[PDB]
């Protein structure tokens, strides 16, 4: 969906659904993405440099449910706001010694 707010006032944005890196990116027409605002399993946090301390990522665990509260909104920080996780692991074997004589 979408929303329009008046410059100044807040917005809180919500994400439902083995959690690791969590994110909100935006994009406005014609700009490449921007990554706002991140979350570790641990609870903390990162922010981009244009946020300067008016929103807040948050988690609630037991939804899987992140919000981003942004206050003090401004016209530049108009966009398409998305929530983003990634999943990484490797396995391995157990090795196997090769010995070559010769």
Known sequence: ???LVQAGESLK???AASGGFMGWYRQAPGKQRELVAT??????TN???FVKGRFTIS????????Y???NSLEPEDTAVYYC???YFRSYWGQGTQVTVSS
């Open 13 to 15: 944005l919500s994400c």
């Open 68 to 70: 981003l509260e942004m």
């Open 1 to 3: 969906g979408g929303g």
């Open 39 to 44: 979350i570790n399993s641990r609870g903390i």
């Open 47 to 49: 922010y981009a440099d």
């Open 59 to 66: 988690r609630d665990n037991a939804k899987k449910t992140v």
């Open 84 to 86: 983003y996780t990634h």
